Structure 1
Amino acid sequence: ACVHHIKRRDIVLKWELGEGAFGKVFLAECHNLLPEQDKMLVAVKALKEASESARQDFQREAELLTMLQHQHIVRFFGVCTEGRPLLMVFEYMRHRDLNRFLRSHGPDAKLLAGGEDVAPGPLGLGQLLAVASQVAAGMVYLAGLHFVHRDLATRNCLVGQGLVVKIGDFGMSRDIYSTDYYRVGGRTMLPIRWMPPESILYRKFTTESDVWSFGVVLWEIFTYGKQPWYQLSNTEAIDCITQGRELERPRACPPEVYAIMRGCWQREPQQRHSIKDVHARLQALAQAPPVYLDVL
């Protein structure tokens, strides 16, 4: 109802960028979208099924995405519901999702990994903190709106040119991340490795469970995208989480940044730091002078 609409003629599909079980994303030109840019590139999502349910979920995602538009939430330009197929039009983010980006600039990266956008070699402390800070700011906004994400992970963040990082949600049906979910029969899937004890045990998801998940995202960032509890099966991960075991400090993570993770991982939800306090801490370190960060 409140969604911006884009005329079908104004969208010109170029080629497929990627897909999940239920959706495909295309690169496209979109014209008369932004005035200063007669023709810009966008990412266009189309459904891979019809009849009723997914079309409801389409307009659900649309109204939600419009409501949640903010500087570090994925940018949504609107819909094309003029006939079929139904299309959702997103800002194009060249470096794709944050987990891919992290893995392609990890401990073994060298000169080749550098580009117009990012330095060669492994992402430096300054850059890792800048990424962490942007994700935290997005979570601050969502906590402000009392939106509970429930699947916060680097795989669900996008990275654009300039290394602008924004929080999205691709659902749980990309083959490449099937391993990041524990499938409970037909119920269906849970990102247990990112979930706090009270979510695993009591099936409660709150703003405080999101702070825990952000703690795990912070860990992902400083391990350059490796899966949490990678050494464990799903049931062994559930055992470890519920019994209070904690992810170890990443090699690239200074003790002070680890203190922030652990503050997200307080067993009792009310004892966890607020996301706004986490963001404040991370932004300070992100913006701190090289002289300070070099001995951090």
Structure 2
Amino acid sequence: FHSFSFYELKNVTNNFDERPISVGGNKMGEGGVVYKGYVNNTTVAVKKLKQQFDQEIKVMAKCQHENLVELLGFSSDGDDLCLVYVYMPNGSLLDRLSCLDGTPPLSWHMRCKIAQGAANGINFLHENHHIHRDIKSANILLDEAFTAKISDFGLARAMTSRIVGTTAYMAPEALRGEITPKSDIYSFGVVLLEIITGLPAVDEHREPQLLLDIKEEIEDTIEDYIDKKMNDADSTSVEAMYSVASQCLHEKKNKRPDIKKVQQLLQEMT
């Protein structure tokens, strides 16, 4: 990891121009704020935010995998804390599912590669005894070849008083304070429902507001929910991915499959 001085990161991000890229600024998104930078011949991602910063570096130093984002460097010039990453041209899975900024809809073929890639990333994390604690489509980034790269390891862990994560993706025991890798499985089940439907996990102007509630709705079909912005989706593979998501979303943590089974099932699907 390269140690950058804050001034270097100031200059490459147009003094952290917080305006969105579309408006002429450098902001890519927020969780801290993510800025586009240009360091020499390289386009980079600069996250300007301490325990979460030290944890992000700690996890990245140990975890290097093609389905995890790569940390290039950092900056800790007192007050301001920055994390520098390899640039992901196709942004997040959330934005590609919503076709934000007019990007074309992802094909079913591509969606299957993304789901498999994301499962391989979680498997590496779990094999290396790490619980992500914030698995969501906004944290699944896409490179130039649409290779799934898991991001945001600031809250990662090797019961708690401080409950953290994204409510719409969280398992019941996670909402209660339990720290378990079985909780990441549940959240991935929500991500698989987003991949199938193209619907966000939460929508205030929707019935049901929460995507995970459609599983109970179907248990009373998935064909009605399949993303219509695809022409290469076959019922056999869609139902097979839904079966994986359904198993992931079992409300009883011990009845959910481990990431290795999830990988195996996603492999058997294609």
The TM-score, its normalising length taken from structure 1, stands at: 0.68
Q: Deviations over 1:187-241 (max 9, x none)?
A: 67652321223334x432311121111111101111224225752467xx99x69
1:43 maps to which of 39, 45, 62? 45
Give the corresponding residue for 1:94: 89
Give the corresponding residue for 1:196: 171
Give the fraction of aligned pairs with identical amino acids, expressed as a percent: 28
Counterpart-to-counterpart distance in 2, 1:163 and 1:64:
23
Q: 1:188 to 1:68 in 2, by over 3 A?
A: same
Give the corresponding residue for 1:222: 196
Counterpart-to-counterpart distance in 1, 2:96 and 2:263:
21
Q: 1:195 to 1:81 in 2, by over 3 A?
A: closer
Q: 1:74 to 1:214 in 2, by over 3 A?
A: same
Which residue identity is paired with 2:188? F
Shift, 1:44, TM fit: 1.4
1:211 maps to which of 179, 185, 191? 185
Shift, 1:256, TM fit: 1.8
Determine if contact 1:218/1:261 at 8 Å carries over to the other structure.
yes
Give the corresponding residue for 1:29: 38
Counterpart-to-counterpart distance in 1, 2:260 and 2:52:
31
Q: 1:203 to 1:188 in 2, by over 3 A?
A: closer
Counterpart-to-counterpart distance in 2, 1:224 and 1:251:
8
Count of residues in Structure 1 that have an aligned counterpart in Structure 2: 236
Q: Deviations over 1:149-184 (max 9, x none)?
A: 121110111111111211112879xxxxxxxxxxxx
Matches within 5 A, 1:12-27: 12-15=11-14, 16-20=26-30, 23-27=32-36
Determine if contact 1:216/1:228 at 8 Å carries over to the other structure.
no
Counterpart-to-counterpart distance in 1, 2:167 and 2:33:
26
Give the corresponding residue for 1:267: 251
Counterpart-to-counterpart distance in 1, 2:253 and 2:164:
23
Shift, 1:129, TM fit: 0.7
Shift, 1:87, TM fit: 2.5
Shift, 1:84, TM fit: 6.6
Unpaired runs of at least 5, structure 1: 32-38, 48-54, 115-121, 173-186, 289-296
Which residue identity is paired with 1:197? P
What SS does the aligned partner of 2:3 have? coil
Shift, 1:94, TM fit: 1.3
Matches within 5 A, 1:1-296: 4-8=1-5, 12-15=11-14, 16-20=26-30, 23-31=32-40, 39-47=41-49, 55-81=50-76, 85-104=80-99, 113-114=103-104, 122-169=105-152, 190-200=165-175, 202-228=176-202, 230-232=206-208, 245=216, 249=222, 250-252=225-227, 254-285=238-269, 288=270
Q: 1:211 to 1:189 in 2, by over 3 A?
A: closer
Determine if contact 2:133/2:165 at 8 Å carries over to the other structure.
no
Counterpart-to-counterpart distance in 2, 1:150 and 1:257:
22
Which residue identity is paired with 2:28? G
Pairwise CA RMSD of aligned residues? 3.3
